[PDB]
Design a protein around this ligand. Structure first.
Ligand SMILES: N#Cc1cccc(CC(=O)N2CCC[C@H]2C(=O)Nc2cccc(Br)n2)c1
Length: 221
């Protein structure tokens, strides 16, 4: 997260850290008791998920790490694209929910967010262009752009864009949430891109666009 501020401890309880060998790799969103939604190139090996956290390092009453039973990348995703860039991770066991750990509702209604709406993006991604990794969760409020602006700058119905005027998501915020009026609208994409540049907006997979896939995987809870 660039141009942001420290999040308040535990105030965003859906936030997950997707990890490889005890290192934060990707954002994720608790979307059910045993499933975390992330991006498809996060996975790409022994994968684990950390819930309940503000600091990555420090002892906190609510922190807990989990193993992964099963990775289900979208079957049309390809290594070389950010099309269908979603990933469902089945935890090895159901998570212990509470004030600091709970699922965030995701947008089932296939409708665009109102342009200019400030949504909230959080992550343990880099907080500067020298790639500094924050211990504690950061966040930043960001305005959503209209679909036409999203098509022109960058280049489909399956992606959305947000303004990035030195405030942006970046590397390691991948797989993480764009939250708008308390609801998950975007999943930060997981291919590399320029961050913090007005002209090259951040890109987010429209979760609504994949309602049928997500249901069909979780159709077995
Ligand atoms: N730049 C850039 C960039 C912007 C969005 C997404 C990505 C891809 C990314 O961040 N990935 C690919 C999956 C592994 C993950 C990653 O590299 N995480 C990572 C790596 C170093 C530091 C931190 Br914090 N996080 C890169």
């Amino acid at each position: 997260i660039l141009g942001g501020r420290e999040a308040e401890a535990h105030a965003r309880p859906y936030m997950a850290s997707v990890q490889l060998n005890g290192a934060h790799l990707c954002g994720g969103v608790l979307v059910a008791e045993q499933w975390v939604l992330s991006a498809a190139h996060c996975l790409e090996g022994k994968v684990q998920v950390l819930l309940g956290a503000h600091s990555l390092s420090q002892p906190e009453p609510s922190k807990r790490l989990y193993d992964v039973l099963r990775a289900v990348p979208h079957p049309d995703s390809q290594p070389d694209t950010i099309d269908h860039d979603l990933l469902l991770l089945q935890l090895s066991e159901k998570a212990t929910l509470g004030p600091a750990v709970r699922p965030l509702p995701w947008q089932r209604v296939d409708r665009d967010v109102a342009p200019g709406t400030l949504c909230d993006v959080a992550g343990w991604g880099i907080v500067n262009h020298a790639g500094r990794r924050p211990d504690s969760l950061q966040h930043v409020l960001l305005p959503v752009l209209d679909r036409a602006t999203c098509n022109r700058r960058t280049h489909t119905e399956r992606l959305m864009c947000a303004e990035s005027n030195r405030r942006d998501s970046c590397k390691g915020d991948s797989g993480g949430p764009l939250v708008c009026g308390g609801v998950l609208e975007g999943v930060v994409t997981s291919g590399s891109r320029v961050c913090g540049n007005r002209k090259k907006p951040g890109i987010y997979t429209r979760v609504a666009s994949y309602a049928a896939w997500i249901d069909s995987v979780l159709a077995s809870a």
